[PDB]
Design a protein around this ligand. Structure first.
Ligand code: NA
Ligand code: NA
Length: 101
């Protein structure tokens, strides 16, 4: 149905280990731009600054999806990201959303 048309343009930092995602979180809280944190730490989409692009409802792993649709759109000078990190079967994610449908 209608909810299958919902989507987010989403960016993340993924780290298997909790200690490393915590290092990434500290960099965000120091003011580092999200894409630069993703380049330093992410194990997915690092060469894209963490950008996953547009993702439709159903296409994201469950805990990620719930966290992502809960975030308002933000930009990387004024980011709104998940805190605490979100655990999935891939590891720990810090997520921000740059577009919403
Ligand atoms: Na861990
Ligand atoms: Na999961």
């Amino acid at each position: 149905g209608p909810m299958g048309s919902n989507a987010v343009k989403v960016r993340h930092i993924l780290c298997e280990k909790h200690g490393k995602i915590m290092e990434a979180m500290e960099k965000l809280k120091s003011g580092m731009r999200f894409n630069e944190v993703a380049a330093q730490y992410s194990e997915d989409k690092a060469r894209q600054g963490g950008d996953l692009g547009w993702m439709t409802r159903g296409s994201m792993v469950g805990p990620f999806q719930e966290a992502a649709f809960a975030l308002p759109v933000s930009g990387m000078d004024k980011p709104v990201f998940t805190d605490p990190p979100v655990k999935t079967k891939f590891g720990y994610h810090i997520i921000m959303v740059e577009g919403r449908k």
